[model samples]
Target: LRGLSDLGGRVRNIGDVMEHPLVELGVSYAALLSVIVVVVEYTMQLSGEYLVRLYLVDLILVIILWADYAYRAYKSGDPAGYVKKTLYEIPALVPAGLLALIEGHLAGLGLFRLVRLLRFLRILLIISRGSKFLSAIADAADKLVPR
Candidate 1:
């Protein structure tokens, strides 16, 4: 792995670029927005007309996530390993994209709505990666404990 300074001679990798504080903060902010969209879509599934628009919004989000995944893999310099590591995300994202495409035809089959819950996997992945919120929770828990 190359350090951020080797930019001119090596690949101007996003892996290096994203290490900047502003980029990390921006990524976290986008992640928070994605989580909010998932929550809103989950809750609004009951609203028939609202669901149409929400599904479109979800499709757009899925595309963005897919593009981000592709970009990260490309920048990692080991695209195969990146895909292997993130294999779980494929199932979570694919079904949502398919469901969004056929939502109109499958209207009233509320059971399909359960598939959307898989989107939470993305949120869990972010939390597992050490978000500020998770860090704060860990800090608070440590303070409360007698260790």
Candidate 2:
């Protein structure tokens, strides 16, 4: 099948899906939720199968984000620049936490924690750049908070 209708007249390719407001908003919330998942996991210090389940869920979510990032890079005529500017996205991709399950070593564990710190920072960079809701929230926050 060809590209789907854009409602009015335009044919929207799947590549254009990221341009939609819903995906934009959904992914932003997904990111924030993922961070909460991380913070919550640490606070409770839960263990066993459930911990693996958490990593798997987070892995899937991060993959979806990677898909969006790559699609956007593909759509950018100057693909190199788009990819180049997004260096922060690399940390989460390492997924040291998931890798630890394979190695099962404490040495692997420390990097797992450290890597996510950079990953969190990367998410912060993204939340600031895009996400109109966050941008608006930031505007209000800017006024409400002290300088």
Candidate 3:
């Protein structure tokens, strides 16, 4: 069997692969799609025949986010520190899982639906951090707007 350091090296390499431009683009697209799904479902008050489909979509989005979070934690040499730093994501993640299970009954919970906005904001923050264009825009806005 490989040694622990060797395993760590392999994991770090995998993490690097996850950060590839194509992979990042795919993740960003998925995150944006998830936000769109949340907004549409929340606004439409979908029910009856469409409920199952909505639940399935919510489940899929939550799983994707969970996978992304787990990957990042695994990649970080200090998993605990990584989780602690991203702890704000918990409010978004936990409710999504719960809503997936109890979607029918909780559909009207406006506050719970708003939790998803947190996830959307987090995704935007991640994308902005990685994009030079976004950084330039932010810098320009900072210069124009009085802090």
State every prediction's TM-score relative to the real structure: 0.49, 0.52, 0.52
Model 3 clash pairs?
A: none
lDDT of 3 by residue, 1-147 (tens): 323543467767776876776766555666666656655655576775686687677678778777878877876666787779997666455534464545545555645575566557545544443453354456557767976
lDDT of 1 by residue, 1-147 (tens): 645432333445545764565655554555556556666665555576877766677677666556667777876677887789998666545534564556545555665564455456545544443354465456557867877
Tens digit per residue, CA lDDT, model 2, 1-147:
345423322225553653576776676667666666655565565777888788888778777777777666765544677667776655435453754554456446654665556547545544443443465467557767976
Model 3, residue 34: distance off in Å is: 0.6
Best prediction by lDDT: 3
Clashes of 2: 0
lDDT at residue 53 of model 3 (Cα atoms): 80
Ranking by lDDT: 3, 2, 1
Q: What overall lDDT, based on C-alpha atoms, would model 1 receive against the true structure?
A: 0.58
Q: Give the count of colliding residue pairs in each prediction.
A: 0, 0, 0
Whole-model lDDT, model 2: 0.60
RMSD of each: 8.0, 8.7, 8.7
